[PDB]
Amino acid sequence: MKTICLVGGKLQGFEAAYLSKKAGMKVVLVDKNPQALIRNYADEFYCFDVIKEPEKLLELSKRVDAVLPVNENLACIEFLNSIKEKFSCPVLFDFEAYRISRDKKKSKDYFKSIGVPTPQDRPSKPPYFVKPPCESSSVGARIIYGLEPDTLVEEYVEGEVVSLEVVGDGSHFAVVKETLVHIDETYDCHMVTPLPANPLFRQISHDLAANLPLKGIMDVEAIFGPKGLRVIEIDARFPSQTPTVVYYSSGINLIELLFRAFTDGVEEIENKYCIYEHLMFGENGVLIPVGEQVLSMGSDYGKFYEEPGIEIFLCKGEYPVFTMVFWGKDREETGAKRCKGLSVLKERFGAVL
């Protein structure tokens, strides 16, 4: 049995934790927040700030197989970077890749320098898509029809949002599984589903990874626009939502793959279906789709229910949020499981959708 130590107890952390358990690893969580979201989901939980008490972490590091940072707190990351050489286990992170990826303008310079199409900056014609430079979860993302000098203003590119994760080991870059990112009115993601292979997207994602070169995990988001594919961002860190769907649809566990990238090495390159979504239990148990930004306001997050083809997790708080996962051999069965799941909530927990 392997033990993974996660630094970060929210959504990134949940996904890593969730996938570590499928790989049957013990999961140890470090988080500075006593009310860390997944605090009861992890096998062990140590509440401390790693910048304040680095020694506790280095110590943990003597007793785990790997440390995975799963937060986007730049102080935390830079700090981890400055002490990484002292861990007694691999640190499953690419810090240089993260440096380009967290800055959206920098990421766009990177796209351009390797010939990858990306929304045009500062167009004159409305609409403009505008969003902060270094956020995630689409915090601040907005359509427009006095921002900052550094706000990104882009052409609005209509069409589907699509995601691919790549795991690299520095030499080989394993492009995994395409997913469809369903967005809500806040440009947040409330649902993910898997897509058919897309070779162009796959080759672009390989090049992005290979020119770093990536050692660790990144995701590539693209919009399939009316004038072709446009990469809008990359995020070099363990993602939430999509790896679960990649797991059921493709059979690949990204935590497993990420762990191999820093040990064995990885090699390059199922076809089941999976639906993954968030639904807020609203007043009178009317169900409302919500994005990550809501789920992440929660107070406790753990497993609620499971039967074959159906997992349900409850994020407790100011209106509970349910994360549902359904899967099966094809869209049909999955849809059938989605129905059974909803009817579990409906008949037993008073829900209505």
Ligand X SMILES: Nc1ncnc2c1ncn2[C@@H]1O[C@H](COP(=O)(O)OP(=O)(O)OP(=O)(O)O)[C@@H](O)[C@H]1O
Ligand Y SMILES: NCCC[C@@H](N)C(=O)O
Q: Which residues are annotated as a binding site?
A: 10-12, 31, 49-50, 72-73, 104, 131, 138, 154-157, 163-165, 219, 221, 233, 235, 237-242, 292
Q: Segment contacting Mg ion (CB under 5 A): 72-80, 229-237, 276-284, 294-302? A: 229-237
**Burial class of residue 63 in the structure, from the number of CB atoms within 10 Å of its CB (0-12 exposed, 13-18 middle, 19+ buried):** exposed
Q: Which x/- pattern, by CB under 6 A, does the window 166-205 give for ligand ANP?
A: ---------------x-x---x------------------
Site string for Mg ion, 122-151 (x = CB under 5 A): --------------x---------------
**One-letter amino acid of 209:** A
Q: Using CA atoms, how far apart are residues 48 and 50, in angstroms rounded to an integer? A: 6
| Secondary structure of residue 325 in the 3-state scheme | strand
Q: From the CB of residue 33, how many other CB atoms can be counted at a distance below 10 Å? A: 12
Binding status of residue 8 toward ligand X by CB under 6 A: yes
- Pinpoint the alpha helices (H) of 122-250: 199-210, 242-250
**Is residue 89 close enough to count as binding ligand Y by CB under 6 A?**
no
Q: Which is nearer to Mg ion, 233 or 277 (CB)?
A: 233
Q: Are 305 and 326 in contact (CB under 8 A)?
A: no
**Using rule CB under 6 A, residue 130 touches ligand ANP:** no
Measured distance CA(309)–CA(129) in Å, rounded: 38
Min dist CB 132 to ligand ANP, Å, is 8
Q: What is the nearest approach in angstroms of ligand Y to the Cβ of residue 283?
A: 27
CB of 165 to ligand Y, least distance (A): 7
Q: Using CA atoms, how far apart are residues 91 and 44, in angstroms rounded to an integer?
A: 19
Determine whether 175 is exposed, middle or buried from the number of CB atoms within 10 Å of its CB (0-12, 13-18, 19+). buried
Query: What is the contact surface with ligand ANP in residues (CB under 6 A)?
Result: 119, 129, 131, 135-138, 141, 154, 156-157, 161, 181, 183, 187, 221, 223, 232-233, 235
Query: What is the contact surface with ligand X in residues (CB under 6 A)?
Result: 7-10, 30-33, 36, 49-51, 71-73, 76, 296
